[PDB]
Amino acid sequence: PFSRRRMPYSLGTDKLEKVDPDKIKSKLSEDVERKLETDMRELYDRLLPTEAIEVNRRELVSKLERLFNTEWPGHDIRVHLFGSSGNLLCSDDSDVDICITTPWRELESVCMIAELLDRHGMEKVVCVSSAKVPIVKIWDPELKLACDMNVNNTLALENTRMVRTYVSIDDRVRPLAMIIKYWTRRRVVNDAAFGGTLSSYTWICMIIAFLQLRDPPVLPALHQQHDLKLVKQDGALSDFADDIPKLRGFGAKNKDSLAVLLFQFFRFYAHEFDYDKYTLSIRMGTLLTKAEKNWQYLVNNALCVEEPFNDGRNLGNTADETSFRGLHMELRRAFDLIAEGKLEECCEQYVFPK
Ligand SMILES: [Cl-]
Ligand SMILES: [Mg+2]
Ligand SMILES: [Mg+2]
């Protein structure tokens, strides 16, 4: 019984002003960079997961796999981590995302799973059967983990494997992405479902797109690197290049530090990127126009971020015009603070009004 709209309609829908480029700081001073760098690695160390909690995620997987195969024997039911839990970007307070696979299609009834998990002591058990991807949500009070589960959405397993591959290519990607994600949680702009802002997966695509567009690039366009694609276990070629040992080091030509990349990330999205004209596409690794995708007609197209496996889908579709204006303001707010090295203020915890 509470409204979670992050960006109030009183914000309006107007485009932000194009700032005189000579007034937009182009690089960190040496003092600001050095201190921001040490602050970011201190933040990253606190964000890194601990082994005790990582063990709890795997125990939840095992517990769930046992519950399911005991209740419905014979169907080779398997339980897989994905999302943050499988792409190297989770922290200890990250929820668990789980994909349950089986050829037994009758398991795709998420409320049947809710009844079983409730009966065996899970708490806050809810099922959402009308979502694009039906889910069951639980709180495990023994392991103290929140968990969203779906059944047989293998597409999410592949784009998790893709993000994991991107994270594995250059060692700056994991700390950069974790710190930006932490920023999105603290400013509460990571809630596409109820807040009208952007999903964590949308944010990760924006980070990867920015890194692909650096000169030199930090990350390649994996979907376009046909010669480094391996054959998967199902016999088909991978959709994206995934021979990690051959890919590792691709970004080594780019010599910018973590501090400079965080500054440039916010500078890019605060002032450089023309939201009105372009679509970000980590599938291509280059900018696309909205018009070449017919996305000038798309409802909720202020921000266009192409899903790399279904390029008909805009990940930015959860932000209407008002929400985009507030997101853009948050990105400029972040740029102004990181330009002066103020990582703590940048990550101030947003609280909803009463
Ligand atoms: Cl993630
Ligand atoms: Mg989740
Ligand atoms: Mg529009």
Residue numbers in the entry: 245 to 598
Q: What did the article's authors report about this structure?
A:
Template-independent terminal ribonucleotide transferases (TENTs) catalyze the addition of nucleotide monophosphates to the 3′-end of RNA molecules regulating their fate. TENTs include poly(U) polymerases (PUPs) with a subgroup of 3′ CUCU-tagging enzymes, such as CutA in Aspergillus nidulans. CutA preferentially incorporates cytosines, processively polymerizes only adenosines and does not incorporate or extend guanosines. Here, we report structures of the catalytic core of T. terrestris CutA (TtCutA) in the apo form and its complexes with a non-hydrolyzable CTP analog and A3 RNA.
The other crystal was CutA in complex with an A3 RNA oligonucleotide, which was obtained by soaking crystals of apo protein crystals with RNA. This structure was solved to 1.9 Å resolution and refined to an Rfree of 21.3%. In the CutA–A3 complex structure, the 3′-terminal nucleotide of the RNA occupies the position of the incoming nucleotide. Therefore, it represents a product complex that forms after incorporation of the nucleotide but before translocation of the RNA to allow binding of the next incoming nucleotide. In this structure, a single Mg2+ ion is observed that is located closer to the position of the divalent metal ion A from the canonical fully formed polymerase active site. This metal ion interacts with Asp341 and the phosphate group between the last and penultimate nucleotide of the RNA. The 2′-OH group of nt −1 forms a hydrogen bond with Asp341, which also participates in coordination of the catalytic metal ion at the active site. The base edge (imine nitrogen N1) is hydrogen-bonded with a side chain of Asn397. The exposed 5′-side surface of the base forms van der Waals interactions with the side chain of Val377. The third nucleotide of the RNA in the CutA-A3 complex (nt −2) is located in a narrow cleft between the finger and palm subdomains.
